[PDB]
Structures are given as structure tokens and as C-alpha cells.
Amino acid sequence: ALWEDRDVRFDVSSQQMKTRPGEVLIDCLDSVEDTKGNNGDRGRLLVTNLRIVWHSLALPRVNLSIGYNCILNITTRTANSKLRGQTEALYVLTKCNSTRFEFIFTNLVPGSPRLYTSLIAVHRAYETSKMYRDFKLRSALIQNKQLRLLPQENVYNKINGVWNLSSDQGNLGTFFITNVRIVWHANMNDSFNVSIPYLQIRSVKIRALVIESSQQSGGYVLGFKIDPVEKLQESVKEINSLHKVYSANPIFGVDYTDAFVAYFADGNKQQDREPVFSEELGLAIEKLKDGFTLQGLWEV
Amino acid sequence: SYSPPELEGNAVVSYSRPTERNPDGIPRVSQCKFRLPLKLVCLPGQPSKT
């Protein structure tokens, strides 16, 4: 399963620190050091298609893997004046499994590194290319009775009369089978459309056509009925063949244990209490601790 | 009008050696001396006596 773009893992196995099949390395830099962990441990930073991997370069057991669908704030800090060269630093701020992590990567060699620009550029491409690798409902996929193609996408076939076995009135639609996703859009109300990428499709079969999607990012059961069963099985064949040829090398469309405690963005806190309503402020505020109050926390 | 205290001359050069600690290099300085000819600030004349 694909996790290198979805999670933030610590002390990764040397087999998972290696390029996943669809992944490609983009850039690298040596002597990068790990701050927000005050071990002084030199290392090496690597920016890949889907994530940033830091490893100690002396004891590669201790290392970090941060996915791009987990980073919220990527900033560059150019500081550290004449005393030495400008040791540029990088500040990554992430939210994984409902917890805020903060990583500081300091380039010990005084030169300014070109890695910190490629990082942000590939992260921008990742965020702007999520139509390749995610499930989308009722989005803007059709200009005028015609699909809108991704950067790396070719439409393979276009089937008509494709009903949707999830509604009852807006059913008669069109089905585009591509090399990156299968989409269905209604004839009337062309804003009723679905787009399932092969990365999410887990099993295509007939039951009259059923797509079962990955339970790791929402397990949906999408059913479509076609009038001639011949075209039905033909489309099933095409879809499954495309799924397997995509599975061998994923595209991804990107154009170009207790150690985690030390990397808290908040600080000694990893879970937010339940948001309740505060009658004092008139806003939704997270549930207060036992003794504390709003006016006792506001004062200094 | 007056004559210089010495006909010497100095040429000083200052450069930077690029090293591993500092990529702008240690500053270093070396100098050389030359000796100008007496016939720049002098000519023959009538020799006085006392």
C-alpha cells in the first residue's frame, strides 16, 4: 500500500527509506542537520517525488520520512550573518494523524543550498496535482460535454448510456476510461460526476459493474449499469488491464518509536480536546481543562 | 621640490585563500620591495668646494 505521501514516520526501515516503485528522487544534500531534536546529529536530506527523507548519515537507523500530503507550512529561514556563511535553515510544519509536528533542517555547510527551492517547487506540484491520486465528487471535470485532461493523461474510451447505481433520477451518464482514472458524469446536471483514480480502485468486477475502492482512503461501492453486456465486459477488461499496467509503475502526476515526542509543533501536547461552545466568547473553543477558565488563561 | 627620504618602493598584494572552514577564504598578504634609480630625482651639477 502507498503511505509515503500520507504519513510522517520516524526511525524508518532501510527498505522503506528506498524509492517506492512510482517514486522518483528529485534532490539531495549532505551535512543537513536535524534541529527540533537537540542531538546535534549530522545527517543527509533527500527530496523525492512524494516525501522528504532525512537520515543520520552516520547511524541511519535514526531518520525521518515526511509526506507532502502532510506538510502544511514549508518556509525558508535565511539568517546567521557574517560570523560564518549564511547557514540557511528550513522549517517544515505538518499535521499527521491529528498531531502537529515541526522539523528544522539546518544546512551546516555555509553555502546557500539549492535543495530548499526544489523542495517547495515539487511540493507545489504535488498539491496542485491531486486529481491524479484522490477521490473526487461533483467536482469540475467537464468543460462542454467533454472531459478536462490532466497533464499526464490520455482518454482511452468513452462509453454512453452509463447509469449510476447510487441515485434514482440523474442517472443516464457518460463514462471516460483513461490511463489515470475512470470518470462518470451525468448527461443532465453535468455537475453530478465522479472521478476514481486507479490508485484508489481496489477491485473492478461485475455483480452491473462494481468498483470497490481502497478502504485506506474511503471504501466506496460504485455501481454502473450498461445496456449491452458485451460492452459491459469489454469495459471491465479495459479497466482492469489499465489498473494493472498503472499498478506496476504508478504515475502520481507530480510534474518536475517514542522519538516522535521530540518533534511536537505544539510542545508536550499531541491531541486536542473536543471543541465545545463558549458562552463567554460566543465562539467554538476547545474544551477547557478542569481548573482553567477563559479569563484566567487570557491574563498574564 | 624636496628629495624623498628613500628611493625605495613597496608593492603589497592581498588575496583570499579558499578553504574548507570558510568558503570566502582566509585573507593573506604578501609584499615586495623595489629600489628606484638615483637618476630619477638627481642630475650632475657643478661641484662646490666649501
B24 to chain A: nearest residue by CA? A85
d(C-alpha B42, C-alpha A192), whole Å: 104
Helix boundaries (H) for A34-144: 115-128
Inter-chain residue contact B22 with A111, CB threshold 8 Å: no
**Structural resolution in Å:** 3.1
d(C-alpha A14, C-alpha A2), whole Å: 16
A83 to chain B: nearest residue by CA? B22
A89-98 LR contacts (CB < 8 Å, sep 24+): A89/A35, A90/A116, A90/A119, A92/A52, A92/A66, A93/A265, A94/A8, A94/A66, A94/A70, A94/A265, A95/A70, A96/A7, A96/A8, A96/A67, A96/A70, A97/A7, A98/A271, A98/A272
Phi, psi of A231 (to 5 degrees): -60, -30
Inter-chain residue contact B22 with A84, CB threshold 8 Å: yes
Q: With H, G, I as helix, E, B as strand and everything else as coil, classify residue A194.
A: strand
Alpha carbon separation from A256 to A249, A253, A267 (Å, rounded): 17, 9, 35
The residues spanned by each domain of chain A are 1-133, 134-248
Beta bridge partners of A184: A175, A194
User: Looking at CA atoms only, how far is residue A112 from chain B in angstroms?
Assistant: 11
DSSP state of A217: G
Cβ neighbour number for residue A135 with a 10 Å cutoff: 18
Whether the CB-CB separation of A235 and A157 falls below 8 Å is answered with yes
DSSP letters spanning A87-115: --EEEEEEE-SS-EEEEEEEE-SSSPPTH
Alpha carbon separation from B2 to A120, A169, A238, A248, B38 (Å, rounded): 69, 112, 103, 92, 14
- In terms of Cα–Cα distance, which of A87, A30, A93 is closest to A57? A30
The structure was resolved experimentally with cryo-EM
User: Looking at CA atoms only, how far is residue A110 from chain B in angstroms?
Assistant: 8
Whether the CB-CB separation of A108 and A32 falls below 8 Å is answered with yes
Phi, psi of A243 (to 5 degrees): -60, -45
Tell me the chain B residues in contact with residue A85 when contact means C-beta distances shorter than 8 Å: 22-24
Chains A–B, number of C-beta pairs less than 8 Å apart: 7
Beta bridge partners of A102: A93
Whether the CB-CB separation of A61 and A43 falls below 8 Å is answered with no
In this structure, the strands spanning A155-162 and B8-17 are unpaired
User: Looking at CA atoms only, how far is residue A84 from chain B in angstroms?
Assistant: 7
